[PDB]
Amino acid sequence: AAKDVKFGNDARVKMLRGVNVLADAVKVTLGPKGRNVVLDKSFGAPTITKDGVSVAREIELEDKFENMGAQMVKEVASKANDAAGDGTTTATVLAQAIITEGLKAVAAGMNPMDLKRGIDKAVTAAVEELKALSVPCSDSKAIAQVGTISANSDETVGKLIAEAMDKVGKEGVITVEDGTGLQDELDVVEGMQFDRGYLSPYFINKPETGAVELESPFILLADKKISNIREMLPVLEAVAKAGKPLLIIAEDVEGEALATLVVNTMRGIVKVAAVKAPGFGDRRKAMLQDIATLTGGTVISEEIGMELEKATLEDLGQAKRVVINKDTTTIIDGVGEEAAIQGRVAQIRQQIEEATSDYDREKLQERVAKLAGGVAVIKVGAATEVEMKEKKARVEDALHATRAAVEEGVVAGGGVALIRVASKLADLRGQNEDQNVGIKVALRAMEAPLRQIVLNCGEEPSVVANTVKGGDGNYGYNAATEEYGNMIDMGILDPTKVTRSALQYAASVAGLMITTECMVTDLP
Amino acid sequence: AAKDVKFGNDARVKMLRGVNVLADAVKVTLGPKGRNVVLDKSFGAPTITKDGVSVAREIELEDKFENMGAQMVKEVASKANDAAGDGTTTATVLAQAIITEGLKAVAAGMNPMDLKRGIDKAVTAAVEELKALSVPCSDSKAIAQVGTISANSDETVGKLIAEAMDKVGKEGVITVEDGTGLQDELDVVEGMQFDRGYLSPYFINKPETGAVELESPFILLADKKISNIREMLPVLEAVAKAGKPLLIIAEDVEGEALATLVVNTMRGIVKVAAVKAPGFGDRRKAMLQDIATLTGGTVISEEIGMELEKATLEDLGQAKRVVINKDTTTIIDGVGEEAAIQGRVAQIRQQIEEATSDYDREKLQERVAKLAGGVAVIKVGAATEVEMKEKKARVEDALHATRAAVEEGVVAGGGVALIRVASKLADLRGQNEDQNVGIKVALRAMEAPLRQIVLNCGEEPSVVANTVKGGDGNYGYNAATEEYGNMIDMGILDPTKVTRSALQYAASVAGLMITTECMVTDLP
Amino acid sequence: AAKDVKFGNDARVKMLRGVNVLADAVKVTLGPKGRNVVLDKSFGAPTITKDGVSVAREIELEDKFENMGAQMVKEVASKANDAAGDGTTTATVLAQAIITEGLKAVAAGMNPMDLKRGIDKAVTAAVEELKALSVPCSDSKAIAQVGTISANSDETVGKLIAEAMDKVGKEGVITVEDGTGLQDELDVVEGMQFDRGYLSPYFINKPETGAVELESPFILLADKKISNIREMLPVLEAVAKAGKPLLIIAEDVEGEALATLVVNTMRGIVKVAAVKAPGFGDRRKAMLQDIATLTGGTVISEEIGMELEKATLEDLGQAKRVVINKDTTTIIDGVGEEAAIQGRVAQIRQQIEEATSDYDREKLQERVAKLAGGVAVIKVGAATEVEMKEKKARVEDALHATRAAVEEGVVAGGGVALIRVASKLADLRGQNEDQNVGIKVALRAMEAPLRQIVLNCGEEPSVVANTVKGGDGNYGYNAATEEYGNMIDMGILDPTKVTRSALQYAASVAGLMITTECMVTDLP
Amino acid sequence: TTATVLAQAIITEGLKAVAAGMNPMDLKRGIDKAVTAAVEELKALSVPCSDSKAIAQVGTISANSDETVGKLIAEAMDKVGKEGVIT
Ligand SMILES: [Mg+2]
């Protein structure tokens, strides 16, 4: 595939045009009263949505290079959402603002590297200002308070979120399941979650979630990389007859074994998924065993002399539910014996006391938390299935905001916090004039999300922002009610973590584009 | 098919245009303050990188002839990295400068052959100047000193390099393995390295490395060329059943067996790799035997009457690790008995006594080193698996730099060494008037890497080059800190070998283009 | 299909353009300081060579008719290499000069038939001059002298060539084999060479050589034309288990068996080659038998009642090496017993008494020479494979030059010999005025290779040639050292046979083009 | 030629200033004020040219460093006087 190359302004201008298309389309849906965007669907009638993430997902440009601009922003914006749960659209809005003004500066004869440096300094100062601005969240009322707000002013949802965290801790693992009964249920059951993703995007049976949900699946524990389909065949045939899904944990799965399973799973016969074993080197051997004890399974080790091909249902572990997302795997309600698992914890507790290394005490302690802490599950109850499933989405959305709020506290969510920081460091400047311009670009860019909100609502952006500038603290304008006041008090806020992640990611992508002198793509 | 032919000025102009595109894109990332380059992918988003090598690999031009120019530079630049481990971007930078100014000279009516000679004379003088400029690196302090710098100021990485060399030797074999735990472990285990590449690129399971890593594979030793698939089958299925990779050492493998093994390995049945036996004639027979003793394997010889088809696992040697690169084969921790291995060494030591020829004593001595010297292995410790691969990559990069530093010492790495040498031989004149022009071209061209660094840093190339010229020795400008001083003492340097190799290759390709009178290619 | 036909000048002009393209691209690489050419590959990137033959192979033209001219010259030039071993580029150079001046003459309105004939007298007279100019090579000192020069100032290469001839004889059979060790080995072993080509070009396993080399292959001796694949099966299958290549000697092989074997040998199960038997009729029966005794194999005769299907391995002769080129087959180190081989010789020596004619005595004597004389072989010794194989190529070229040198002696190789002869017969005139024109065209065409040499070097051809003409005999200009004197003494010479063959082929092809009224080809 | 160069540098930098968010009318005033100050400095730097050699040097420098032109002109201006006419 032959490549087309553009330099300097020809390159940068195309990125600007590309980013603006993505940004302009996505920006309209940011506010409470945000405007809706029509997306075509290959089969059936066209889709109408107010969600920026959905719109961002659906945008790819005709012109390569312009496409690059949009996509570069999308990758980083997606990361903000993946690390914060919200602000995907906000990051893009901020990215456009920094990028559009920053590019003018490079084309004006000013040095791009200095402009980046000025912007980064502004961003660095802004992050700390956000930290001062931020209202901490630690007590149960604050947990419930943020949870109910996120949940769309439903106090019952906030209560369960706080209760879940209270039962397993702030860092504990909380999952959501369809409710069997009308009543909301919160339960503690043996289970474990670890940072391991799925080996294939093809495996996902829940496309909105992006996660794979399996029902009472068999669990295969392995201690070797799997490159050959042959080891799986006797076990593979056995699971299909059952009709139950099979989950595999091992070092890695190579394309020969994995490709057949991928093909077999997608609209095929036996639909199963495989994930990598948690931990590394020395760490994994103990952890796989922890999972084994938890699911009542048997670990298969090449070192032992036992191979996967010589295996039956007896060796496999079991759990009622398991869900696998892009980079995380969690198991729910493992079958392992209560005495076995509790005993395992006792063995580990004894292990903690050698305390030879701080790293080892903590790491052993970490093992205790995953196994002994268990997994807290929340079933969402409702009168009708339609209401029940809808409520479940809301609970999950509140949970991401609550976790972000816990880690860093909260800030005004109308884009007000960005406004608020910009007013505070207006005086800040750099020795190089180019640096001064970079600082101004970043600060001015911060204003955009507020203005975008107001613009979407059909109100004057300049008038609203000007009055907001006049105020102090968490004071701001709420788009939904057209009334000025403390945004946190009135119910509109964003986690401190999401605002920070969006703003800095936007600056990071912006800085990269500003310094770029060349882009490469294939011919039309 | 029918060919499109250009010759004389027309052929040279296209090469210039082709090389400039390649060089303009790659040159922007050379400095510590490297400019970002965005490389597109057909699916979704573009990528942003400061790595010149990744940029250069990707470049292919639609316009034939121009494409040849770019490719010609890429091949020679690639050779510099292949024989030095670094300077791929630097070679290209120097190549553009030499080629552009010299090429104009040939089109100006100047004799090309003389211009080459003038350029080469300046290049040769510069190489010796580099040798004088170069600071020796023999003691452990120097070994560690260069190793930590290359490792990007990591003192511990330098320490392991120095200690490994201290044991096995400068000429010894040092390899890097993923670490078992937090500590970095260095150990010497029985093993052997020889200069033999892999028969097929398709074999590589580590795409960034360009090498094939196998875990505790069975080893097949053969005394015949393998053109037929069929002999392999009884051993081939047996190894697959065993569940481990198979490594083959023999005279050579033909496409009849090679192509099927490739097909068999890529997304298929069993993934194994094969390499050619070390030495030739008398040497291979003794050398293969040394490997057999080392891996505890059995050699199969046509001359004896033994055949591959009749062989079993017990006839195969074993090692915990084996890695195969483009031109080198090495094995780690051979299973062969200490009594057998050490006893064989005694047999070889005894052989050395005959001293019939310097050639046999030299060669026998070489056998002793490989068989008895052993292999030094370095495990890289880390708190996380991602970090562990990260630290490991850095060690490998440092190791090439240390080996290069050992072989020829080191020079200032800011492009300063090229500057320093160019200034020293300003006076030098050729025979023909045209030759004198070539000399100026070569010397002026040398300036470019420094200027490029400064250009990438947003600083004036002419002003920095001018100040550097004024100073002497290793004195120069550090782009990263915007300061002037002794570049080696400031932690910025390049191995003498990489600087020399990049400068020599740039001149070699440049001269080559200069003397090229005709280009033939397919129509568009 | 409909075809494009053009007449006279229209047909001839296209041939002229075709030959000029081929000659212009090839001629630049003729000199010692020749200019390299860049050719592109489907498989990767471009490679550069100063070798005219490689350039010629890749030259094919867009315009049918022009392509034919180039191909016609390539055809004749290739033949010169085939019958001389060198001067493929020289033949092409001479062809362009003769053709351009002569072809213009036909275009003007001069008689073509006379022009060819006029050129022929020039050529015939020049060849006689070459014979007088030519220094004979008979003694060992001359043999070694030319051999070392051809090898490129390597005394050892020439010394072995002289020694090889000194053993088996000037007309004996000398072959080249890879060296098992450091020492160069020249020795004699039973073997036979005969003039027979390979049935299919597809058979060649050595594309640079254009020949098929096999390792200790089984030899099939047959007494019938082969038309049917079925007979082959029991023996073909037999060689397959053995794993060794199979060589076939028979009257001829038809497409029915030939096509399947060709497909079988390319990307197939058994890779074998087949050639026609030496001699014919009555002579053939004895000739095949001589090979049978030599190989120790059994000849299958239809007349007897023996059939190929009824054959086994014991009926197949063996030799350590066999090599087949475009029209010659030779075997090395036949396994046949010395007692039987010598005994076979005794039968032939006894036969000579029958001699009722000189032809029969001679023909029988020739048989004695092939069998009893044997084949001498050369193993090329070197420190490493790269040097060993590289050295081997040079030895083969020196060998061809020595055979050509022995058969006709040598002439100045700077193109000087053509210059010297052209100056000598300035006076010669034809009958018709048109014939006179042809003579001048041929005599000044002779100059072209010298001038081309000087042109490549970047020196003025007109100036060099004038001074060389002023001199006498072998006196001329050495392009490599920029000096004047005896070219032969200096180290630059061409075999008389190659110079003559190049010149005669150039004139032969030229005359055919001069006399070619019409051209017919496929549509574009 | 020199005047044109000044226009080139003034406008290139001035436009850059315009792109910097500055009021052009003010930029013009700044330029005009700087020029007024520069002229006075020029007035101070200027040294009277009264000798033949200096006049020759200006003629020679103007004539692209041609000595004969300066020599010929210096002789002329001296001979004709201050109000004399040279063509
Ligand atoms: Mg003037």
| CA D61–ligand 1 middle distance (angstroms) | 8
Chain A residue with the nearest C-alpha to that of D17: A108
DSSP 8-state code for residue B135: B
* Contact (Cβ atoms closer than 8 angstroms) between residue C25 and residue B5: yes
| CA B60–ligand 1 middle distance (angstroms) | 51
- Whole-number Å distance between alpha carbons of C25 and C19: 10
Look at B383 and A516 and tell me if their CB atoms are within 8 Å. Answer: no
- Whole-number Å distance between alpha carbons of A9 and B59: 21
| B345 sits in which H/E element | helix B338-352
- Whole-number Å distance between alpha carbons of A405 and A509: 25
Q: Structure resolution in Å?
A: 9.2
Place of tokens 């970047």: C458
Q: Subunits with at least 3 CB pairs below 8 A relative to chain D?
A: A
Please state whether at least 3 CB pairs lie below 8 Å between chains D and C: no
| DSSP reduced 3-state for C417 | helix
Q: In chain B, which residues have their Cβ closer than 8 Å to the Cβ of A259? A: 267
Cβ of residue D22 closer than 8 Å to a chain A Cβ:
no
Look at B2 and C45 and tell me if their CB atoms are within 8 Å. Answer: no
Please state whether at least 3 CB pairs lie below 8 Å between chains A and D: yes
Cβ of residue A207 closer than 8 Å to a chain D Cβ:
no
| DSSP reduced 3-state for B407 | helix
* Contact (Cβ atoms closer than 8 angstroms) between residue B221 and residue B298: yes
| CA D78–ligand 1 middle distance (angstroms) | 22
| DSSP reduced 3-state for B281 | coil
Look at A1 and B38 and tell me if their CB atoms are within 8 Å. Answer: no
Beta bridge partners of C518: C7
Q: In chain A, which residues have their Cβ closer than 8 Å to the Cβ of D16? A: 108-109
Q: In chain C, which residues have their Cβ closer than 8 Å to the Cβ of B280? A: 384-385, 388
Shortest Cα–Cα distance, B7 to chain C (Å) = 8
- Whole-number Å distance between alpha carbons of A121 and A115: 10
- Whole-number Å distance between alpha carbons of B109 and B434: 9
* Contact (Cβ atoms closer than 8 angstroms) between residue A214 and residue A247: yes
Alpha helices in B180-280 (DSSP H): 233-242, 255-265
Beta bridge partners of C194: C329
* Contact (Cβ atoms closer than 8 angstroms) between residue B474 and residue B488: yes
Cα distances (Å, whole numbers) of residue A398 to A162, B348, C324: 11, 74, 81
Q: Going by C-beta distance under 8 Å and a sequence separation of 6 or more, which residues neighbour residue C195?
A: C278, C327, C328, C329
- Whole-number Å distance between alpha carbons of B316 and B294: 11
Chain D residue with the nearest C-alpha to that of A436: D20
β-bridge pairing A218-222 and A317-324: antiparallel
Q: Subunits with at least 3 CB pairs below 8 A relative to chain C?
A: B
Residues 56-85 (A) with a CB less than 8 A from some CB of B: 60, 64, 67-68, 71-72, 74-75
β-bridge pairing A212-215 and C185-189: unpaired
* Contact (Cβ atoms closer than 8 angstroms) between residue C161 and residue C147: yes
Look at D19 and A437 and tell me if their CB atoms are within 8 Å. Answer: no
Look at C36 and B75 and tell me if their CB atoms are within 8 Å. Answer: no
| DSSP reduced 3-state for A430 | coil
DSSP 8-state code for residue B201: G
Cβ of residue B204 closer than 8 Å to a chain A Cβ:
no
DSSP 8-state code for residue B390: H
Domains of chain B: 1-134+410-524 (1.10.560.10), 135-192+367-409 (3.30.260.10), 193-366 (3.50.7.10)
- Whole-number Å distance between alpha carbons of C396 and A419: 84
Residues 410-449 (A) with a CB less than 8 A from some CB of D: 433, 437
Cβ of residue D9 closer than 8 Å to a chain A Cβ:
no
Shortest Cα–Cα distance, D16 to chain A (Å) = 6
Look at D19 and A104 and tell me if their CB atoms are within 8 Å. Answer: yes
Shortest Cα–Cα distance, B290 to chain A (Å) = 28
Cα distances (Å, whole numbers) of residue A262 to A202, A205, C428: 6, 12, 86
Chain centroid offset of residue A117 CA: 28
* Contact (Cβ atoms closer than 8 angstroms) between residue A481 and residue A414: no
| CA D42–ligand 1 middle distance (angstroms) | 19
* Contact (Cβ atoms closer than 8 angstroms) between residue C450 and residue C465: yes
| CA D1–ligand 1 middle distance (angstroms) | 7
Cβ of residue A350 closer than 8 Å to a chain B Cβ:
no
* Contact (Cβ atoms closer than 8 angstroms) between residue A14 and residue A68: yes
| CA D59–ligand 1 middle distance (angstroms) | 9
Residues 92-121 (A) with a CB less than 8 A from some CB of D: 104, 107-109
Convert B447-496 into a string of H (helix), E (strand) and C (coil): HHHHHHHHHHCCCCHHHHHHHHHHCCCCEEEECCCCEEEECCCCCCEEEH
Cβ of residue D19 closer than 8 Å to a chain A Cβ:
yes
Chain C residue with the nearest C-alpha to that of B515: C35
Residue A135's nearest CA partner among A450, A402, A416, A405 is A405
* Contact (Cβ atoms closer than 8 angstroms) between residue A395 and residue A160: yes
Look at D20 and A104 and tell me if their CB atoms are within 8 Å. Answer: no
| CA D5–ligand 1 middle distance (angstroms) | 13
Max Cα separation, chain A? 75
Count of other CB atoms within 10 angstroms of residue C18: 24
The experimental method behind these coordinates is cryo-EM
Token representation of residue C136: 């004979």
Could you tell me if residue C278 is left (phi over 0), alpha (psi between -120 and 50 degrees) or otherwise beta?
A: beta
| CA D39–ligand 1 middle distance (angstroms) | 21
Look at C35 and B515 and tell me if their CB atoms are within 8 Å. Answer: yes
Look at C25 and B7 and tell me if their CB atoms are within 8 Å. Answer: yes
Which residues precede chain breaks (C–N over 2.5 Å) in chain B?
Answer: none
Cβ of residue D20 closer than 8 Å to a chain A Cβ:
yes
Residues 385-404 (A) with a CB less than 8 A from some CB of D: none
Shortest Cα–Cα distance, B517 to chain C (Å) = 6
Q: Which of C25, C384, C388 sits opposite B520 (nearest CB)?
A: C25
- Residue ranges with strand state E in C59-178: 173-178
- Whole-number Å distance between alpha carbons of B152 and C3: 70
Look at B36 and A516 and tell me if their CB atoms are within 8 Å. Answer: yes
Shortest Cα–Cα distance, A110 to chain D (Å) = 9
| Amino acid at position A153, single letter | S
Cβ of residue A512 closer than 8 Å to a chain B Cβ:
yes
- Helix C496-514 to helix C66-84 angle (10° resolution) is 150
- Whole-number Å distance between alpha carbons of B176 and B393: 9
